C-alpha cells in the first residue's frame, strides 16, 4: 500500500507562542542519520506512491539545508520510481525568497497558518515576545504568490472566529485565497472543555458553520468556487461514501507521525508515551502498523455511540473525529463534543449541499 508520514523535523520547537497551541518535550532537530533511515525505509517499503508531510512545531526551524538533504535522498534512493508527494505546514514567519524558491521548484504543497484579518489573527498568534505576526504571514503569502508556490490557508476556529465569520471570509476573499481549511480549536487533551477565552464551544461552532456555509454557497451560486476542506469532504462522503479527510470516515487511521528522534505515533493528537509505536530506525512500517498499540488505538475508534446508531445523519457524519470523543484517559469514547453542532448544521445546510453535489455531477 502507499505510505503517508507526518514528520516533525524540528520536533515541537517553535518561534511563536500562539495562545491556544498545545504542540509547542522537544527532541530537537532531526539528525541526518534519522532522516536518512526514514527516507530510505519509506522508499523501500511503500507501493504506488508515498507522501512526506512536515509539521511541528515550526518545521522551517529545521533549516533549508535539512530540506535540501531530503530532496537529495529522495532523488538517490527511490529505486522503485514511486511518485513522491511533499508538503509543509508553516507559520510563514521565517519564509523568505530562498524558502519560496525551494518550495516552488520542489513542488511542495504548503499550508500557511492564517486566522483571518489583522485583528483576528494577532489576538492569538503572537510571537515569543508577545508581539504581532500577521504582517509576517502576509509577507509569506506574498512570496508564495510571487514564486507560484501552491498553498492552502489553515485557519484555527476559535470563539472569536465564530463571532466574525463575515470578516474572516471577506479577508480571504479579498486576498484571493481559494483553498481554505478551518481547524477547530481544541482544548488540551483530557482538560475540562470550554475554559479558555478562545475555546470553541459547540454553540459557537454551530454559528460558525452555518454562516460560513452561507458565504460559501452564495459564492458557488455566483460561479466563484472556493474550496473549503470540511465542505469538500461532506461532498465526497455524499458522492463516494468516503472522504479523504481523516476524522470524516468514522474511524481512525495510522498517520505515522514521526518525531525528530524517529519515534512513531498513530495520530498528531496523540504523540504521547502510551501510543509510541516504536522507532522508524529499527522497525518496518508494516511492523509499526501491526503493533498491539496501533491495533488498539484504531479499534477503540470503532465503537459507535448509541445516539449515532439511530441518528439520521449517521451516514453523513459517522460520529466525527475520535479526538473530539475522547473526554477522559482510558474512559470509553463519548458522543462527539460537537454532535449538536453537526445536527443543527446539517438541518440548515443539507438541502443546499445536495444542490451542489448534483451540479458537480
Amino acid at each position: 500500500p502507499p505510505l503517508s508520514l507526518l514528520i516533525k523535523p524540528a520536533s515541537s520547537g517553535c518561534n511563536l507562542k500562539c495562545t491556544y497551541c498545545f504542540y509547542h518535550k522537544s527532541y530537537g532537530i532531526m539528525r541526518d542519520e534519522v532522516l536518512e533511515s526514514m527516507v530510505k525505509r519509506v522508499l523501500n517499503e511503500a507501493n504506488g506512491h508515498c507522501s512526506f508531510a512536515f509539521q511541528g512545531g515550526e518545521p522551517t526551524l529545521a533549516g533549508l539545508e535539512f530540506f535540501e538533504k531530503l530532496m537529495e535522498l529522495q532523488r538517490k534512493h527511490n529505486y522503485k520510481n514511486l511518485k513522491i508527494y511533499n508538503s509543509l505546514q508553516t507559520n510563514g514567519t521565517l519564509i523568505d525568497e530562498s524558502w519560496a524558491k525551494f518550495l516552488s521548484e520542489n513542488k511542495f504543497l504548503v499550508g500557511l497558518s492564517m486566522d483571518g484579518p489583522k485583528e483576528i489573527h494577532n489576538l492569538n498568534r503572537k510571537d515569543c515576545c508577545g508581539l504581532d505576526t500577521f504582517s509576517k504571514v502576509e509577507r509569506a503569502a506574498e512570496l508564495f504568490k510571487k514564486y507560484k508556490v501552491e498553498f492552502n490557508i489553515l485557519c484555527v476556529v476559535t470563539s472569536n472566529t465564530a463571532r466574525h465569520v463575515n470578516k474572516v471570509y471577506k479577508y480571504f476573499k479579498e486576498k484571493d485565497f481559494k483553498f481554505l481549511q478551518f481547524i477547530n480549536c481544541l482544548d488540551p487533551l483530557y482538560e475540562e472543555k470550554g475554559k479558555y477565552n478562545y475555546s470553541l464551544k459547540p454553540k459557537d461552532y454551530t454559528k460558525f458553520l452555518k454562516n460560513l456555509f452561507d458565504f460559501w454557497y452564495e459564492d458557488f451560486l455566483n460561479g466563484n468556487r472556493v474550496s473549503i476542506r470540511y465542505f469538500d469532504g461532506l461532498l465526497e462522503t455524499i458522492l463516494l461514501g468516503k472522504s479523504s479527510s481523516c476524522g470524516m470516515n468514522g474511524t481512525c487511521t495510522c498517520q505515522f507521525v514521526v518525531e525528530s528522534d524517529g519515534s512513531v505515533y498513530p495520530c498528531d493528537f496523540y504523540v504521547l508515551d502510551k501510543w509510541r509505536l516504536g522507532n522508524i530506525q529499527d522497525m518496518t512500517m508494516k511492523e509499526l502498523f501491526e503493533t498491539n498499540k496501533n491495533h488498539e488505538f484504531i479499534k477503540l475508534s470503532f465503537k459507535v455511540h448509541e445516539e449515532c446508531k439511530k441518528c439520521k445523519w449517521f451516514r453523513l457524519c459517522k460520529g466525527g473525529c475520535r479526538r473530539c470523543r475522547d473526554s477522559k484517559e482510558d474512559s470509553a469514547l463519548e458522543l462527539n463534543y460537537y454532535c449538536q453542532s453537526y445536527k443543527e448544521f446539517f438541518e440548515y445546510a443539507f438541502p443546499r449541499l445536495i444542490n451542489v453535489a448534483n451540479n458537480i455531477k
Binding site: A53, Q55, Q89, L109, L154, Q181, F182, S244, S245, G247
Partner: peptide, 10 residues
C-alpha cells in the same frame, strides 16, 4: 485520509 492540520487538495 489525512487530518485537517495537514494541507491537502481534493
Amino acid at each position: 485520509a489525512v487530518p485537517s492540520c495537514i494541507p491537502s487538495r481534493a
